[PDB]
Amino acid sequence: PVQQTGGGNYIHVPLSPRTLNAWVKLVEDKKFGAEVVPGFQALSEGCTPYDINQMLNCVGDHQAAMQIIREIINDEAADWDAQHPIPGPLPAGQLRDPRGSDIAGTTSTVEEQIQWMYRPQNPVPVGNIYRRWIQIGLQKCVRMYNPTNILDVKQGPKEPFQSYVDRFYKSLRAEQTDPAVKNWMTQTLLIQNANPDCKLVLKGLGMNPTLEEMLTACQGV
Amino acid sequence: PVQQTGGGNYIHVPLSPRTLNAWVKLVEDKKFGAEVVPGFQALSEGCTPYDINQMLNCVGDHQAAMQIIREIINDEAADWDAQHPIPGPLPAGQLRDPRGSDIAGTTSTVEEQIQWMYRPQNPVPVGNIYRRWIQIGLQKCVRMYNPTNILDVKQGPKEPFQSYVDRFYKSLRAEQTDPAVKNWMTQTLLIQNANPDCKLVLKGLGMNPTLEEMLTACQGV
């Protein structure tokens, strides 16, 4: 994070321990759930890569997926050298041009990143690009760890349909499939993977039903 | 949210972690009680849409209801477009009168959301309008989740009358009936749906009894 100073200049201001601690608890309590990506972004909002790295480095308990997150980040950096035509050399006394690794933080400091994040001639984000690389790694972890998949989400006679619907959408959310497939899944697979009593009730509800009407209708099973 | 610096300038700020955390707990622990609507407003009071979405996108349980809220928001934006003239050809370089998904903030950036909130030409307060759309979705869920209903709420023979009242009013609230219906229900259905022993006493109090008088007299029956 950075604090502006009189004259239009900026200085580094450290990230809060509570924010770092809150990130670790979200990772452990939710076990790399799908909600570990968005909460992280808010906790890491207006931050540089240097501070973001600390949070990721603070945890050593789960390093199987933090290692996967690392692979994707350097992959984006490897791709970054071509995505951005190499700028070439500039005179001495001027800031260096940012590369893939500078975005990751394996090499650069918070001040160089602060100067890049607040450069009047060529302002460049180094932490929005990096957090995105981390988030792409975080999402792969969610899908790899997801316990039961959408096709296997099913309702038992005892299970109330509502409960089965929450599990189905949570899994559908963990996956990032095309919306069209989701529509076929949310209108067909949902009625299909139900207890047969309420499935017949959903046939009574009609064709092209809505979630409010499906939930209101099977209120009792 | 929004932070205004000297000179009339406006900037975006992160949303505090505890506010996100408190919103998450209220949604899950209260199982979408009727206080998850106001609990959302206070925590989101004076914030930008970009940070709201996050709060709603940091919760992984009761996800089916979150899908209902998403649909309601889309519909409000549809009506907004119908009631807001597409300005059409506009001076290029003029902040675009925000459209439907520019109030929700999905198709727009936080800065222009802040710029519309205080736009000198025609400020569009994106924040209050979007929170209201979400609130309507939250309110539908409270009703759908509500376990029982006012008509079926009935004092147990051995159950005390006051407990029946706590159950009755909580539902006269969860079911958001018009105030006139509320007066009629409170003046009558709290006596009709009661057990006979206390009902006679409530009739003995006199016509238009008041709740203080009804609770005091039926105390210990």
Next chain:
Amino acid sequence: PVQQTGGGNYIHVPLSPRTLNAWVKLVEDKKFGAEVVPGFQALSEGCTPYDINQMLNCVGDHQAAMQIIREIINDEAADWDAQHPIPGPLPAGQLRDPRGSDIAGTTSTVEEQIQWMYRPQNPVPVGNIYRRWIQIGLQKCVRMYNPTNILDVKQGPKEPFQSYVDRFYKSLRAEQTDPAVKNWMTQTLLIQNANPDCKLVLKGLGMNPTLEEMLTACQGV
């Protein structure tokens, strides 16, 4: 069918008796299967609606699916009536411009159908339009009749993967699903709903195996 003779003089002929019979048998035996849609066309190519109406009528055993086809023809004709309305008072020496019902062949005579089909001003092949309207009705029936759905198709333990994929694919076509959904099911639902022994053998293939490679690999499994 129709038959030009001299001076471009088109005339009417009888529809072959073994063509009416073949349509009946294709329908009675394939039970309105998917191939009924094209088999109909090959047996009705160049036939006017009148003769097509005789073929469909000769089938008297199945009359619920034929009604579904009939309900659809009425609609298509009502969209050709609204969008192509009565021209008005046609000048002397003109024939009423073809309407949707004339395309159906219920009102217009075979001669009038031929006059429009070869009309120098309105050469509208009434036959191919009615044939197209019928296909849609036949296709709804195929989807409505198909015995086993894709989610309900699962390989038998004593059955091969190739036999199961054939039952699975036949169904995908009867369901007539969107192409994006088709790819997901074909690359996934064909493995999830497979004998566990061959499912693991479809994992050693790699990622996105092709059907050519999926079968050869599970050959004897």
